[PDB]
Design an enzyme around this catalytic site. Structure first.
Site, short mmCIF file in Angstrom:
data_model
loop_
_atom_site.label_atom_id
_atom_site.label_comp_id
_atom_site.label_asym_id
_atom_site.label_seq_id
_atom_site.Cartn_x
_atom_site.Cartn_y
_atom_site.Cartn_z
NE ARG A 73 -3.44 2.15 3.31
CZ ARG A 73 -4.65 2.16 3.83
NH1 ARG A 73 -5.10 1.09 4.33
NH2 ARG A 73 -5.00 3.25 4.26
CE1 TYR A 205 -12.48 5.17 5.93
CE2 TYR A 205 -13.76 3.52 6.24
CZ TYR A 205 -12.58 3.93 6.31
OH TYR A 205 -11.47 3.16 6.72
C1 LIG Z 1 -8.34 4.90 7.03
S1 LIG Z 1 -7.91 6.59 7.41
C2 LIG Z 1 -6.57 6.69 6.08
C3 LIG Z 1 -5.86 8.00 6.06
C4 LIG Z 1 -4.57 7.81 5.41
N1 LIG Z 1 -4.51 8.02 3.89
C5 LIG Z 1 -3.66 6.65 6.03
O1 LIG Z 1 -3.85 5.81 5.29
O2 LIG Z 1 -3.10 6.66 7.00
C6 LIG Z 1 -9.15 7.74 6.63
C7 LIG Z 1 -9.13 9.00 6.66
O3 LIG Z 1 -10.12 10.04 6.01
C8 LIG Z 1 -10.41 10.90 6.71
N2 LIG Z 1 -11.77 11.21 6.10
C9 LIG Z 1 -12.81 10.48 5.84
N3 LIG Z 1 -13.90 11.13 5.28
C10 LIG Z 1 -13.58 12.39 5.61
C11 LIG Z 1 -14.21 13.50 5.41
N4 LIG Z 1 -15.45 13.60 4.68
N5 LIG Z 1 -13.79 14.73 5.65
C12 LIG Z 1 -12.35 14.83 6.20
N6 LIG Z 1 -11.84 13.85 6.38
C13 LIG Z 1 -12.35 12.37 6.24
C14 LIG Z 1 -10.65 10.23 8.01
O4 LIG Z 1 -10.63 11.19 9.18
C15 LIG Z 1 -9.50 9.39 8.20
O5 LIG Z 1 -8.44 10.01 8.75
#
Ligand SMILES: C[S@@+](CC[C@H](N)C(=O)[O-])C[C@H]1O[C@@H](n2cnc3c(N)ncnc32)[C@H](O)[C@@H]1O
EC number: 2.1.1.290
Length: 666
Positions: A73, A205
């Site tokens: 990844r 998400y």
């Molecule tokens: C599974 S984490 C992955 C983050 C990073 N790409 C990593 O792999 O470490 C998903 C991130 O997307 C952010 N996220 C999802 N939907 C969001 C939204 N609508 N607005 C701001 N942040 C969002 C979440 O806060 C989270 O920190």
């Protein structure tokens, strides 16, 4: 009301915790064991640099499959970003916009001038992290209170942060307008700056409508790349691993919503065109694996003990790496190009045999079973821990009973999986060959079990440890042994009476390499046996051959002779099992493919060795959907063939026990 929102929002922010940890686990284990090239982080003294530690409280450890998944990844994103920096003309600034950054320190890793592995990024690349307000407040306080991090971005209860080379901007991406505003306030409209928008499993998400808005918004920015990495469900929400994955995510209160609308690699392509990105290069994680160089592959195998390949195939096909561009200038050189070939194959539906639900629970996998006359014995396997215990199976038209058979001997073979267990001695005994404990602990000790005395007794051991081999009984009572992970002969014949193993590897260039977890079966009638699929010890290639062979019991130097080779994409399966139902009809069952998931129609196929024609034995929607299916680490018994045992650990999305299947005449 607005409470229901501030909860589902923090649940999504919680997933960062889980993924930053996993990445940290790879920093601890993998990176130190890896050469300069696939290293990611390193200073001038070849000393590994660490960035994920500032963001993770504790040391963490993962399954070898999750660890591998996360290295891939990091390689995924890094490789994409690399193709861009390398190519972009030398007069253009570059901005990487991380959408939903989490605690991801990619910025600091690439900016840090100590890290000589990211020197192409030291000069002309800048970064913007975008995430919920709360998650950034926390992240921003760390960055400020850590001399190593603060120094990198030129620093000495907010939620924003500004520096020459790094920004952090609060924003709910569900709010399209506010994002559109952010794009403008960050001057990303500028044609003289290449934009690289990264969505690493974040837009996954958000709802299809809300995520697509983000994408279209960015498409108005001239000279923009969009790299997205997220889940697929290439065969519907009901495919065994999909089912498990989706459910896991509802449970965390952070369901995958966009994937429901965008199931396949193909839908991802149409999605990006529709949304303003004409140029799209896209493949799933296993093409990324395949694409890694031989020296890299060699390294990655040696990093840690691994034998969870079915899992890895499943996981890999459920993550797409999509690289899109909104301009012709940028080329997808052959080094970064994925190949795309969905060749839908229609199979005639077998009219002689169908598939029934058998509701039968031995609740274990990678043991082995064999019938001694009337009684049916299963030995060893894992549940999910390794056992050396023998179950006896009573098969009825409705279900199967099982009782533990206790043993009278004090000496007993150790708990083991991926062994063979074969009736010998005129149905009077059971032969146990090889197996393993942990992946790095292959076994060489072989045993025999006496049903009459219920005693175990160890015999001559192997010269080479061997697991994941296949084995079947020959007419004369001897046992043919096929490949597996091993340093020894690709094929063995165990003479039960003589008490000797003999190397019988056929003089075909096919058996040059040891064949792992291939299907294997003999037919006393047609005097023929088949070998099906099977993978190689490089953990990349998977045979697509179906090899017919005969067995001359009297020929002492070459008893086994390759009769005929067949080739079909449906034969390409790791960990399948086959069984003759008819000297003309070879049932083939499950396993995983490097080239995509199996579905209802082709998970179970038949083969007519002679006329060379395939037919499908469909799994009804009723059972596809309702009953947990997981054709991996399973076995086949015949009273009517039974597909009992089996299961998988779906990448820490939980585990899935194969519930049982039954083949009947029509
Ligand atoms: C599974 S984490 C992955 C983050 C990073 N790409 C990593 O792999 O470490 C998903 C991130 O997307 C952010 N996220 C999802 N939907 C969001 C939204 N609508 N607005 C701001 N942040 C969002 C979440 O806060 C989270 O920190």
């Amino acid at each position: 009301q607005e409470r229901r929102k501030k909860y589902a929002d923090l649940a999504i922010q919680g997933t960062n915790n889980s993924s930053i940890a996993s990445k940290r686990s790879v920093e601890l284990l993998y990176l130190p064991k890896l050469s300069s090239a696939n290293n990611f982080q390193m200073d001038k003294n070849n000393k590994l640099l660490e960035y994920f530690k500032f963001f993770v409280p504790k040391k963490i450890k993962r399954s070898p499959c999750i660890n591998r998944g996360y290295w891939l990844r990091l390689f995924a994103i890094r490789s994409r970003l690399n193709s861009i920096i390398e190519q972009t003309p030398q007069d253009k600034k570059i901005v990487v916009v991380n959408l939903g950054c989490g605690y991801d320190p990619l910025p600091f890793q690439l900016l840090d001038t100590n890290n000589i592995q990211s020197q192409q990024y030291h000069d002309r690349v800048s970064f913007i992290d975008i995430d919920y307000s709360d998650l950034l407040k926390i992240k921003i306080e760390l960055i400020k209170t850590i001399p190593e991090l603060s120094k990198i971005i030129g620093l000495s209860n907010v939620d924003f942060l500004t520096t020459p080379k790094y920004l952090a901007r609060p924003c709910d991406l569900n709010d399209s307008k506010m994002f559109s505003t952010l794009l403008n306030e960050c001057q990303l409209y500028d044609p003289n700056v290449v934009k690289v928008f990264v969505a690493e499993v974040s837009l996954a998400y958000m709802k299809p409508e809300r995520s697509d808005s983000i994408i279209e918004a960015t498409s108005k920015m001239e000279n923009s790349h969009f790299i997205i990495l997220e889940q697929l469900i290439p065969k519907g929400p009901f495919e065994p691993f999909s089912k498990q994955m989706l459910a896991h995510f509802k449970r965390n209160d952070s369901p995958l919503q966009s994937v429901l609308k965008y199931n396949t690699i193909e839908s991802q392509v149409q999605r990006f065109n529709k949304l303003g990105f004409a140029y799209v290069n896209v493949g799933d994680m296993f093409q990324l694996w395949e694409s890694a160089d031989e020296a890299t592959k060699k390294e990655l195998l040696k990093v840690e003990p691994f034998d969870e390949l079915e899992e890895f195939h499943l996981f890999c096909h459920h993550y797409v790496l999509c690289h899109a561009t909104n301009y012709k200038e940028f080329a997808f050189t052959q080094g970064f190009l994925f190949d795309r070939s969905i060749s839908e194959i229609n199979l005639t539906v077998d009219e002689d045999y169908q598939l029934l639900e058998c509701e039968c629970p031995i609740n274990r996998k990678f043991g082995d079973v064999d019938v001694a006359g009337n009684d049916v014995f299963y030995m060893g396997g894992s549940n999910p821990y390794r056992v050396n215990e023998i179950l006896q199976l009573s098969i009825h038209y409705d279900k199967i009973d099982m009782k533990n058979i206790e043993v009278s001997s004090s000496e007993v073979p150790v708990a083991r999986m991926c062994h063979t267990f074969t009736t010998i001695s005129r149905n009077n005994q059971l032969l146990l060959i090889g197996g393993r404990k942990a992946p790095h602990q292959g076994l060489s000790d072989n045993w025999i079990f006496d049903m009459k005395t219920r005693e175990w007794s160890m015999i001559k051991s192997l010269s080479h440890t061997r697991f994941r081999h296949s084995a079947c009984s020959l007419p004369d009572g001897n046992v043919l042994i096929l490949g597996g992970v091993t340093e020894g002969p690709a094929m063995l014949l165990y003479n039960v009476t003589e008490e000797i193993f003999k190397d019988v590897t056929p003089k075909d260039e096919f058996f040059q390499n040891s064949l792992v977890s291939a299907g294997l079966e003999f037919d006393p009638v047609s005097k023929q046996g088949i070998i099906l699929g099977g993978g190689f010890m490089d953990q990349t290639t998977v045979s697509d051959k179906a090899i017919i062979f005969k067995y001359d019991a009297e020929n002492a130097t070459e008893p086994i002779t390759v009769i005929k080779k067949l080739q079909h994409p449906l034969f390409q399966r790791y960990g399948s099992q086959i069984k003759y139902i008819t000297p003309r009809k070879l049932l083939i069952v499950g396993g995983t493919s490097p080239s995509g998931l199996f579905d209802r129609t082709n998970s179970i196929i038949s083969l007519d060795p002679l006329s060379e024609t395939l037919t499908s034995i469909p799994i009804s929607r009723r059972i596809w959907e309702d009953h947990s299916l997981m054709l991996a680490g399973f076995s086949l018994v015949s009273t009517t063939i039974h597909i009992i045992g089996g299961g998988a650990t779906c990448y820490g999305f939980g585990s899935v026990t194969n519930v049982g299947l039954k083949l009947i005449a029509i």
